[PDB]
């Protein structure tokens, strides 16, 4: 999911409305829809992708 989410943020300070977009994007490509509370971690995409992968 690492290079995938790398290119996803190639498509950062955390705004409180981008959470809806990043919640919506997960639902089709990987069909996971991870909880929004679990999407509320840090302001990163690559390092947050690393940590929330493993």
């Amino acid at each position: 999911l690492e290079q995938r989410l790398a290119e996803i943020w190639q498509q950062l300070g955390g705004h409180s409305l981008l959470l809806v977009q990043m919640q919506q994007y997960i639902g089709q490509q990987c069909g996971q829809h991870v909880a929004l509370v679990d999407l509320l971690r840090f302001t990163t995409i690559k390092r947050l992708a690393e940590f929330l992968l493993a």
């Binding site: 955390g14 409180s16 409305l17 909880a35 929004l36 509370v37 509320l40 971690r41 840090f42 302001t43």
Partner: protein, 867 residues
């Protein structure tokens, strides 16, 4: 182990006690007050904020922010206009918190400590522009600690929005490591704009409709509110051997922080709120199947709400049961308080633990999109609802979070059950004392038990009137009440000073004076009620009876107590053979009783029989020798022949001049009153011819004519009886009767004084313009009637009175109300009665109405908005 929460106090929005808070949660009322368009453009707010689409003009507000009663504490009215309005209200709340526990701060044996927290100083735009250095967030608690004599630690903890529940979590460690012995720990939030709105934002934290819905899918934000509130804490092994009221027993606490394991500076965390909760519940000793009521923060924001629910479901992970634990919020009812909002939930949970009823959460229809109630162990009420768990013991938990992060979780077990039937029963009557430093704060404190006592919510009379006597301080303007049932007293206290109970200012009065009574005023059921109630009267009465059983044959406690009521029993004791020693024993037993309640006598007069016991209260001779003299004297003076009596209403010189016969003067009492005596025919001769004069002449109804001219032989015989015994110099300032003046060392030591006592006329009037001249004293009778106290206030005793001790014959069953009315009428004047011996067997305290302060405006009038 535990830390009890003994008393509470507050001043919330649209409720000004903690029994108007608990009658606005139970009725499920919305306490938020909406405004108009005219209530803002007259309170000096700008015309650009108003008339704005999203300018929500709601706030949950308190009424009187500018009402201090300065003179109660000693503050001049220029150090009252130079105080932050959050200092005055925390003073008037820190007084009522110590009065809702039945304690006084100033005279507790241990130490007392205050750990509170101030809000943002908003008086730096109200007082700074006109004048002002010396009132910042640092000296709230020393001002609370100086005016009430608090001699423990005095700190100001200052976390951001959980100040009020970090203060409790410091004061629960200060007690548990013995820094102090009783604490007090709260917060405050009050500001000059009590009438203001808020420009709400689409995407912010402020609710754009006015209402604060918590855990609902229509959540918009919160709404700002103001308040106050303080509690009182004490160790749970020192709140069980003293008998206080315990609301709840705090069993665990923890305080933490986040620290850069989140998004931003202001963004919540989950991994720290799941550690505060699961350290509180593991320090307490519990397990998450037991916490039945959890008080979430529940502020009503967008992201602040699924984070908190996730944190709760993470920490309740061990419980394998479905939908068994409540969840709620306060901030739907009263809005969001800012700094005092950790303790306004601690009050609600610590009351709902004690009563056993979970109040209702307003504004709740459907859960949020990111929450599943049905697959989690929580549920949300909407109607008020009873509470009883499966295990039988109710437990709880309150949580508050701060801006930086504090996660203050506390755990509140139910107070243990008590044993209220092992107490010995209530006493027959009790005194209810009410004292207040000014008159207008006494009338409004009397019209405040009017509404308390006429409910069906009312405590015992033994646990009340030990909170009103031992649990407050006795100020000047005091009034008291002796009652049997409380509803009638509630009716009596509301009739607004057209009522029969004691009243009046109390000054110093260092010393009380004693009037001792004479013959002829006794009755049948006399001295019976006090014998089987009080121990000192019964003990000191018993010694006088047992000695005279030992050395004579008259049985006492037979004719007064156990003998049958008849006509012949009335005149059996009215004979002179029995009337002397019974009356002496009664007056000595009553004197012994009145000393133990805290009376120091100064002057001790007599009237024809009070010399024989006013002497022995000065210790001039022993009690045994006193009884051996009095019984001998009464037997020796009984065998004299027939005599008579008369009362004449003419002065002493006129009777000593205008008499017809050589008749001896028996007694001089008042300057309208004297008694003449003589033989059984000459008195009848002068009485009938004086009736023709139409000057009044009753009799005294005695077979022997005392103080006449035929008692030399018996007097010399008892002088021969005198010289076996020995005497002593006196102690107290007796004045005499036949001499008309004071008493020296050898005045009572001479055996001839008791000889001339029976022959010379006793002159009561000359002993009573001299006593009130050399002393300035009130007079308390010790005697079986009310004759002397009717005579004594008939003189020129200016602004002094006289009181009795026993009922006047006809009210012979009021010997337990009449003395207890004398006590409550002496205590109003200022005397040193301790009203704690009239309490009961073993009392506890109860929450009673506090002091009723005055209300004076002290403001700079905000010149900025005045222009």
């Amino acid at each position: 182990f535990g830390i009890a929460i003994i008393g509470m106090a507050g001043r919330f929005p649209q409720a000004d006690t903690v029994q108007a808070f608990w009658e606005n949660l139970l009725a499920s009322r919305e306490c938020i007050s909406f405004y108009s368009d005219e209530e803002l453009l007259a309170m000096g707010i700008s015309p650009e904020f108003v008339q704005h689409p999203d300018y929500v003009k709601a706030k949950g507000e308190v009424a009187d922010i500018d009402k201090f009663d300065a003179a109660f504490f000693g503050i001049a009215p220029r150090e009252a206009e130079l105080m932050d309005p959050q200092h005055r209200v925390l003073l008037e709340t820190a007084w009522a918190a110590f009065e809702d526990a039945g304690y006084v701060a100033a005279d507790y044996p241990g130490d007392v400590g205050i750990f509170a927290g101030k809000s943002m100083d908003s008086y730096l735009m109200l007082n700074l522009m006109p004048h002002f250095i010396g009132n910042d967030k640092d000296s709230i608690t020393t001002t609370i600690a100086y005016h009430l004599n608090l001699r423990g630690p005095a700190i100001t903890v200052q976390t951001s929005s959980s100040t009020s529940l970090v203060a409790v979590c410091v004061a629960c460690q200060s007690l548990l490591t013995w820094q102090c012995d009783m604490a007090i720990a709260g917060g405050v939030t009050l500001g000059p704009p009590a009438k203001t709105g808020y420009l709400s934002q689409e995407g912010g934290i402020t609710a754009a409709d006015g209402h604060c819905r918590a855990f609902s899918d229509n959540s918009s934000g919160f709404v700002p509110g103001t308040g106050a509130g303080l509690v009182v804490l004490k160790r749970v092994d020192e709140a069980l051997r003293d008998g206080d009221n315990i609301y709840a027993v705090i069993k665990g606490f923890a305080v933490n922080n986040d620290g850069s394991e989140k998004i931003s500076y202001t963004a919540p965390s989950v991994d720290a709120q799941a550690r505060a909760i699961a350290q509180a519940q593991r320090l307490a000793g519990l397990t998450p199947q037991d916490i039945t009521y959890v008080e979430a923060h529940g502020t009503g924001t967008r992201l602040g709400d699924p984070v908190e629910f996730s944190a709760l479901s993470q920490a309740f992970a061990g419980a394998s049961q479905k939908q068994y634990c409540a969840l709620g919020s306060v901030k739907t009812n009263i809005g969001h308080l800012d700094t005092a909002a950790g303790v306004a939930g601690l009050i609600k949970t610590a009351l709902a633990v004690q009563q056993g009823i979970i109040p209702a959460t307003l504004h709740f229809e459907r859960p949020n999109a990111q929450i599943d109630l049905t697959n989690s162990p929580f549920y949300i009420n909407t109607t008020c609802q009873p509470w009883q768990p499966e295990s039988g013991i109710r437990r709880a938990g309150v949580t508050s979070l701060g801006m930086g992060g504090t996660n203050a979780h506390v755990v509140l077990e139910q107070a243990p059950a008590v044993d209220l039937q092992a107490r010995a029963p209530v006493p027959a009557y009790s005194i209810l004392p009410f004292s207040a430093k000014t008159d207008s704060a006494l009338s409004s404190g009397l019209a405040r038990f009017a509404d308390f006592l006429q409910h069906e919510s009312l405590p015992d009379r033994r646990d009340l009137a030990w909170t009103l006597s031992q649990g407050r301080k006795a100020f000047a303007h005091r009034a008291a009440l002796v009652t049997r049932d409380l509803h009638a007293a509630g009716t009596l206290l509301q009739q607004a000073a057209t009522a029969p109970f004691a009243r009046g200012v109390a000054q110093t009065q260092l010393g009380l004076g004693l009037l001792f009574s004479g013959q002829g005023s006794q009755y049948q059921r006399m001295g019976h009620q006090l014998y089987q109630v009080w121990p000192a009267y019964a003990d000191a009465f018993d010694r006088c009876a047992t000695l005279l059983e030992r050395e004579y044959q008259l049985d006492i406690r037979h004719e007064l107590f156990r003998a049958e009521v008849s006509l012949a029993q009335g005149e059996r004791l009215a004979q002179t053979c029995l009337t002397q020693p019974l009356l002496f024993s009664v007056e000595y037993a009553l004197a012994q009783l009145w000393l133990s309640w805290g009376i120091t006598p100064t002057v001790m007069i007599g009237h024809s029989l009070g010399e024989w016991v006013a002497a022995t209260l000065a210790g001039v001779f022993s009690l045994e020798d006193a009884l051996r003299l009095v019984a001998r004297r009464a037997e020796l003076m009984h065998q004299a022949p027939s005599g008579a009596m008369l009362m004449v209403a003419l002065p002493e010189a006129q009777i000593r001049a205008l008499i017809t016969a050589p008749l001896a003067i028996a007694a001089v009492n008042a300057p309208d009153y004297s008694v003449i005596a003589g033989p059984t025919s000459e008195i009848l001769a002068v009485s009938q011819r004086l009736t023709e004069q139409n000057i009044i002449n009753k009799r005294l109804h005695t077979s022997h004519a005392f103080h006449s001219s035929m008692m030399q032989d018996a007097a010399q015989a008892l002088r021969q009886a005198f010289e076996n015994v020995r005497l002593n110099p006196p102690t107290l300032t007796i004045i005499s009767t036949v001499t008309g003046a004071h008493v020296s060392a050898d005045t009572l030591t001479t055996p001839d004084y008791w000889i001339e006592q029976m022959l010379m006329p006793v002159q009561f009037s000359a002993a009573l313009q001299e006593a009130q001249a050399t002393f300035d004293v009130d007079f308390l009778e010790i005697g079986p009637g009310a004759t002397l106290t009717q005579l004594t206030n008939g003189h020129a005793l200016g602004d002094r009175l006289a009181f009795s001790s026993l009922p006047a014959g006809a009210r012979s069953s009021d010997e337990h109300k009449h003395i207890l009315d004398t006590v409550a009428a002496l205590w109003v004047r200022g005397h040193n009665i301790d009203l704690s011996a009239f309490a009961g067997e073993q009392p506890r305290r109860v929450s009673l109405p506090t002091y009723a302060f005055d209300k004076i405006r002290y403001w700079v009038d905000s010149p900025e908005e005045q222009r």
